[model samples]
Target: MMTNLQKEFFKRLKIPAKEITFNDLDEILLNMGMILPFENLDIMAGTIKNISKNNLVEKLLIQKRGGLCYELNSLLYYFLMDCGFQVYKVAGTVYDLYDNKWKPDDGHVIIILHHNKKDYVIDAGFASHLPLHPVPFSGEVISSQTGEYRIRKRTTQKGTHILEMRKDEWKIGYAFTLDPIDEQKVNNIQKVIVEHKESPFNKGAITCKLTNYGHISLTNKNYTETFKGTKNKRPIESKDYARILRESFGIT
Candidate 1:
């Protein structure tokens, strides 16, 4: 059974009402990638507040705003639990592609779901390129609505698993252990994301939304729209920031 709010949350995800299974899980994520988006506008605006479950419902579900990992994955955490899925939360380190370095281990929030005797990564919060599916722990490739992704054991780190996505080649997205973390840890990371200078999200506005064709994004003064392999990027004028954000990533 689900509350009306929960049902509407799923409805907002465009998830069809039915028996909740791995397929439903996949669709929920797919719709999340399409509808919800990965955004850090709130952080950029310096208006970020609570990341508690109540605030997630208020800001994300009711207000229909795009957000970062804590807001996105944490919301999915409770939503999955309400849907009767065996789920837990974990924090991971993201390998930044631009700077070519690993970020803080406990910064990125992830959700793991156990179903039919296997565990799957149900992450909704990785900015830029997300898997958009329930990636398995079996090291198998998941061909999602966007691209190919897989999780494999990291050779250098003991017990650390790497999430990889294929672009020109397989690129490391993030790495995490199977250790389950609590809400307080997640709350702390959200604070880091907002206040820490090293946090990637705190510098400026960044938004990415999965589109039917490809994807669109606005990072700082640059706005980019990509379909298939080709990309069109142009410097955003100061006067059109809000318009471009709304038109490109649906962020108002």
Candidate 2:
């Protein structure tokens, strides 16, 4: 039975919950990728003191706001489970754009959804170059609503299981493994990323969500909108930052 909360959640995604199918999964993920952005406004504003499940839901659903991997993916996981999808949380190391290397577990959280008999990776938290829907865990190349992706498995120096996704032209986004990790360890990993001084979350404000045409992104004082393979860039004045955020990204 779908609870009132579940009803609202599906409503937000503009999807149906009863007898959900792979098409429904695709719709929900695409809509979520377009609507709920992968942002770090709270961390940028320095107002994020801590994290919690309820607080995250309130911010995303009730407040109509968006958040980074941990916040956004956690909400996606809850909604998927409530809607009767078989899903499990997994921790991953994100590729550092600045450092040009992969980091440790102080990184990301994603979901592995079991549909039919295959495992599909569902990630709604990756900001700029995210797939519009779930991708099969198979190493074969798969095209998504947005781009092409493939997962390759490798063993880390610590003997950790790792799965890396290769975009077009072998661009590596990030990597994860199916190995079981303690929930507390996942939380601690996120906590370290958010609280650490050198972490990118503390660097700048970012707002990027999908649009019917393409995608829109705001980086600090800069704003860029991409649609149908074209890009446009401009600077947003400090005075209009709040207004633009609320109007464009639904961040209030």
Candidate 3:
């Protein structure tokens, strides 16, 4: 039985209830990758400030603020579960480019979906490098709607799982393992995360990702990119943010 809230949620995602499938899930995920963004609203709001379903609809669909992993992925997770997708939750630590180290637990969420004997890393969150749709988790590079990606071999390190995608120069986007996760275990950490001293979302804001020949990114207030066929990043300023957000994602 689908609840009214569930109905509204699908409507927000622009997916019809009866027609929902892995493909629909993939399409929505893919479209959001190039259009809407995964932003860490907690930094602006607060980690302890639990983001409920109502909060997501109001903030994202109504108030117009993007969400980071906790909000973005979780919301999609709910949708996938509601629509019956074979999904599993995984967590990751973001590598701080400035310091060149992984920020474990204080990272993002990713979903692994299995269908017809293929597994995909369905990353609806994470702004740029995330696949627009479900892509094979197998270590093979493939061209996507937005860019090229591959699940590289695991890196050698204690508790470290490595995967690389070719955005440009085969950069490492994120890495994780299938350790048993109980959401209840992380409930306490949620407060520490949003209020922690080293939260990156508070430090700065930027979004970028791989393209066929190159990539695109947004630093604080603008979007810049170099497409697969392009040679350099074409900068689009703050004034253009609204247009890009609307035109690219179909955001109202």
Candidate 4:
């Protein structure tokens, strides 16, 4: 059910949106990791304004500057829905494991897919702890190259749950209810991302992408790569920063 433009979009991703199945999602996710980056440069530059699915494509394809959660997952939502997948978008309360607390609800965006009578989560952004494949609601462990993730009910309520990853002996990544995203909540979050002094997005250059071996992340001069269950991080010269991004993650 992909449109001609949709086919071209996937072509740019090098994925070629053919008639795909649930299994094809993982390939799309993996390829997206390699091609489409998750980054926040405009946020730092104070130019993050109105964002849309069309804007997302131009950001990555024309501008070559990757975007954050809302834009990233929105694109995936549109692609999945247009491809005839039963997909919907949801906002979640982000957590800071160091603070051992969850942020306000609607601080993050993610996707849920109904497939074969079972539901799974798809998160194209929210790097590091992202589940590289769809994680089932059955609480089965979904292991990616560098991480393990699962979903469990909130126990306090039905149709509300949290996503967990095997970081620091299993930590909650983020929590979400089955409710659809609300406009106010999204606008509020977007506001904080662009205007708050303490916003994480205001920090200097950040980018991440996955490779077959593992994943690579860059925050300013700090570069981290995880492979074969081993994580390695190093500080790169500021001068060569763009080179690594262009050569490593294909961002220019």
| Strongest candidate by lDDT | 1
Estimated TM-score for each candidate: 0.92, 0.88, 0.73, 0.88
Residue-by-residue lDDT tens digits, candidate 4, 176-205: 888877544565777877666656676687
Q: What is the lDDT of residue 8 in candidate 1?
A: 70
Question: In model 3, where is the ten-residue run with the lowest total lDDT?
Answer: 180-189
- Cα TM-score of candidate 1: 0.92
Candidate no. 2 TM-score: 0.88
What's the distance in Å from true for residue 26, model 1?
1.5
Off by over 4 Å in 2: 49-51, 97-99, 157-168, 181-183
lDDT of each: 0.80, 0.72, 0.60, 0.76
Ranking by TM-score: 1, 4, 2, 3
lDDT per residue for candidate 1 within 163-250, as digits (tens), equals 8897559988888887888878887988887777688888878888888888888887888888886899989788677887776656
Q: Write the per-residue lDDT of candidate 2 for residues 32-147, one digit (tens) a residue.
A: 88788778877766666345557766778777888888777777777777777889888777776667766654487778888889888888887766676677766666666457
Each model's RMSD to truth, in Å? 1.9, 2.5, 4.3, 2.6
Candidate 3 per-residue C-alpha lDDT over 1-252 given as tens digits, one digit per residue, 9 for 90 to 100: 785556766665565667478767656775455434555434643443565666666665555555666666766766677778788777766665668776655366677777888877777776666666666767666666555766644754423565566646766667766653445433433554565677666665544434445456555465666664654544566667657655543434
Candidate 2 residue-pair clash tally: 0
